[PDB]
Design a protein around this ligand. Sequence first.
Ligand SMILES: *C(=O)CCCC[C@@H](S)CCS
Length: 131
Amino acid sequence: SNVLDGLKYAPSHEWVKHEGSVATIGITDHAQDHLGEVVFVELPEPGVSVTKGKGFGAVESVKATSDVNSPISGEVIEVNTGLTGKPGLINSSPYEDGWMIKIKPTSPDELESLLGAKEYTKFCEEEDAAH
Ligand SMILES: *C(=O)CCCC[C@@H](S)CCS
């Protein structure tokens, strides 16, 4: 699918965007392309703490329920409430308007463990090739 360079990725197909002292999380284009039409998004509550590797919400498609794992840890400060109304933004704008949450990174260096665009692309290739 389509990959962007200014982001750090997770094997479970989530992306992060570091900007000063905040991280914007969402799911990649490869993810939505594989999920199919997204029909519902269940996001966490503000103030709640997310943990690296643990699920914070879920995305439902016409076929299934896909739990989204937080790529890093932090406190949720913001949530895209527009997704409840327009779940489709995930399919149409995964990297921009399809943003799910905004967190205060509690352990910033966790971003080092995160893959880059090229690293992720190779990854997506390997996973697609295992079929
Ligand atoms: C169909 O909905 C099955 C789940 C697809 C999820 C994506 S992230 C699979 C990537 S190989």
